[PDB]
Amino acid sequence: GKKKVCYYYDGDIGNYYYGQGHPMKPHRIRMTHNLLLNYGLYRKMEIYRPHKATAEEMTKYHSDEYIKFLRSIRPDNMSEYSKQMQRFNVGEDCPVFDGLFEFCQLSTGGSVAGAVKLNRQQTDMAVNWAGGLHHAKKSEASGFCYVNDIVLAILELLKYHQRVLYIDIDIHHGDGVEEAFYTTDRVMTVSFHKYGEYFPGTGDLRDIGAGKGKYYAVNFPMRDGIDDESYGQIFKPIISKVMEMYQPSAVVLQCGADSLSGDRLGCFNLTVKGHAKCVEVVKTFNLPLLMLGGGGYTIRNVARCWTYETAVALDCEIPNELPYNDYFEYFGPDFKLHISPSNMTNQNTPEYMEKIKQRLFENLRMLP
Ligand SMILES: CCN1CCC2(CC1)C[C@@H]2C(=O)N[C@@H](CCCCCC(O)(O)CC)c1ncc(-c2ccc3c(=O)n(CC)ccc3c2)[nH]1
Ligand SMILES: [Ca+2]
Ligand SMILES: [Ca+2]
Ligand SMILES: [Zn+2]
């Protein structure tokens, strides 16, 4: 039936700025919050302000040297850290900006607090739209990500859950999370992403895990222009088979919105309904669920997407006509919640989709 939903948000998150021209815009988190408040979605959720995660909480995964660097670097002292900046991949994709460490603490705080709430059985679903920064590595920043809030949240869930399933629907491969758990069977990572001449270059369907983790990493490589019909046709059957074979006791779903049509960096053609069908599919299994953000670079569509996915979590129907809000002008010329797909060609033929699904099913037959 209807579930208890806890939502994590800090009103300062929207003020963090990556710099002029950088596609990552924390302001999209504030637009999402304001839109869902104006739809009345606050009347059904417990809203919490996450704590600022400590360097100590972050070192449950990341190295002490890397977290010490993040806590020390600033735009005013950057000249003294040229050596560590190259070593930790701090540069154009992952720049030094004012309040960088505080932004990491808030993003991580929401994910870890959500996992603690799920572990205590105090909620069925926990939502942190500021999290989902799946590329960050143990001692390296990557792809706009500095601290891997997902790995930290999963480590928290592993205190009470023997098996945790991670599902990633961002257009980019969830490499940081896959790498962190590559040799263990306690986490199964499933990533659906664009593969071929695209960042980060990993996530081949032949990458299936190693050692005790062999068959516990699943990658569905896709080409440009995937649509709701095609995505929906493989998502439910793959997730159903994974649920049946793996039997996880908790789930983490990364809801990166750069897989929507019209994304500034993505080249997929999903609508908000097609993207949200993934949330509906996962929710149907009735397991403790941590829903996270991620990519999304056409910020009016990210706000529409995550507002609709929050409504899905709450089993609340919301009208297509957008209510008046602080960012109303960003949603023109239509002022509607739902989006239309473009005329882009879907390079993922129905035969390619079935063939990749069949190869993934063969790998899933290898689980105990
Ligand atoms: C310098 C850019 N150059 C790209 C090629 C280069 C090396 C840097 C090889 C690496 C690569 O392709 N980086 C990828 C990383 C994608 C992370 C997704 C993150 C998630 O969505 O998965 C989850 C949060 C990527 N794609 C597009 C950009 C991009 C475009 C434009 C700009 C830009 O105008 N500015 C203003 C100075 C700053 C940054 C910047 C970055 N970077
Ligand atoms: Ca993905
Ligand atoms: Ca694994
Ligand atoms: Zn992405």
Curated annotation (Swiss-Prot):
Post-translational modification (record): S-nitrosylated by GAPDH. In neurons, S-nitrosylation at Cys-255 and Cys-267 does not affect enzyme activity, but induces HDAC2 release from chromatin. This in turn increases acetylation of histones surrounding neurotrophin-dependent gene promoters and promotes their transcription. In embryonic cortical neurons, S-Nitrosylation regulates dendritic growth and branching.
Active site: 135
Record's keyword annotation contains Flavoprotein: no
Activity regulation description: Inositol tetraphosphate (1D-myo-inositol 1,4,5,6-tetrakisphosphate) may act as an intermolecular glue between HDAC2 and N-Cor repressor complex components.
Modification sites for N6-acetyllysine: 68, 214
Cell location: Nucleus; Cytoplasm
Main localization, broad class: nucleus
Keywords, comma-separated and alphabetical: Acetylation, Biological rhythms, Chromatin regulator, Cytoplasm, Hydrolase, Isopeptide bond, Nucleus, Phosphoprotein, Repressor, S-nitrosylation, Transcription, Transcription regulation, Ubl conjugation
Positions with a binding annotation for Ca(2+) 2: 181, 184, 187, 216
Class in the EC hierarchy, top level: hydrolase
Tissue-specific expression: Widely expressed; lower levels in brain and lung.
Cofactor note as given: Binds 2 Ca(2+) ions per subunit.
Amino acids binding Ca(2+) 1: 168, 170, 172, 191-192
EC numbers for this chain: 3.5.1.98, 3.5.1.-
Names of required cofactors: Zn(2+); Ca(2+)
Binding site for 1D-myo-inositol 1,4,5,6-tetrakisphosphate: 21, 25, 264
Cross-link Glycyl lysine isopeptide (Lys-Gly) (interchain with G-Cter in SUMO2) mapped to chain: 68
Binding site for Zn(2+): 170, 172, 258
Reactions performed catalytically: N(6)-acetyl-L-lysyl-[histone] + H2O = L-lysyl-[histone] + acetate; N(6)-acetyl-L-lysyl-[protein] + H2O = L-lysyl-[protein] + acetate; N(6)-(2E)-butenoyl-L-lysyl-[protein] + H2O = (2E)-2-butenoate + L-lysyl-[protein]; N(6)-(2-hydroxyisobutanoyl)-L-lysyl-[protein] + H2O = 2-hydroxy-2-methylpropanoate + L-lysyl-[protein]
Residues recorded as bearing S-nitrosocysteine in the entry: 255, 267
The UniProt record lists the keyword Thylakoid: no
Family note: Belongs to the histone deacetylase family. HD type 1 subfamily.
Record note on quaternary structure: Part of the core histone deacetylase (HDAC) complex composed of HDAC1, HDAC2, RBBP4 and RBBP7, the core complex associates with SIN3, SAP18 and SAP30 to form the SIN3 HDAC complex. Component of the nucleosome remodeling and deacetylase (NuRD) repressor complex, composed of core proteins MTA1, MTA2, MTA3, RBBP4, RBBP7, HDAC1, HDAC2, MBD2, MBD3, and peripherally associated proteins CDK2AP1, CDK2AP2, GATAD2A, GATAD2B, CHD3, CHD4 and CHD5.
Function: Histone deacetylase that catalyzes the deacetylation of lysine residues on the N-terminal part of the core histones (H2A, H2B, H3 and H4). Histone deacetylation gives a tag for epigenetic repression and plays an important role in transcriptional regulation, cell cycle progression and developmental events. Histone deacetylases act via the formation of large multiprotein complexes. Forms transcriptional repressor complexes by associating with MAD, SIN3, YY1 and N-COR.
Protein name: Histone deacetylase 2
Originating organism: Homo sapiens (Human)
Range within the parent protein: 8 to 375 of 488
